[PDB]
Amino acid sequence: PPPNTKPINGESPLYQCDILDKQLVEIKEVNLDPNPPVRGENLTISANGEVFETIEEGAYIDVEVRLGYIRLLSQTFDLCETLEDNDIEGLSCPIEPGEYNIKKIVEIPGEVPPGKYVVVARAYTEKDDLITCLTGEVIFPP
Ligand SMILES: *[C@@H]1O[C@H](CO)[C@@H](O)[C@H](O)[C@H]1NC(C)=O
Helix, strand or coil: CCCCEEECECCCCCEEECCCCCCCEEEEEEEECCCCCCCCCEEEEEEEEEECCCECCCCEEEEEEEECCEEEEEEEEEHHHHHHHCCCCCCCCCECCEEEEEEEEEECCCCCCCEEEEEEEEEECCCCCEEEEEEEEEEECC
16 A cells, blocks of 8 residues: 555545654544445545544644645645534534544535545644544546
């Protein structure tokens, strides 16, 4: 497989990246209701993970979406803000250490062109400490 990448257990194409760098959160298991997500349908995300350090306000995520060799999306979102805007139940921003189980539902735009997309997200705390690194490949049939 790719360098510094671990498959995540479960029905998901997700990998953990930058493993040689200490990460504050362990992503134990990830499941998606359609194993390949389907355009124009709901996608259900089940996640099981651990948090080892109190995540406080100021964490941020560098998210990059890429189609082929074209860089489609690159920006930084405020982590707490995003979890609160998307109304994740139980992810109140001061994230205490512990065992977490998260279920979140998102809708896939049907308008999305068919093709092979690569997503890369790196989340860091206010102190710029690496929380996690995740990468994935999704292929949409035409
Ligand atoms: C799909 O998800 C949305 C988001 O909450 C929900 O309101 C809707 O009822 C769901 N529809 C189906 C068919 O699952």
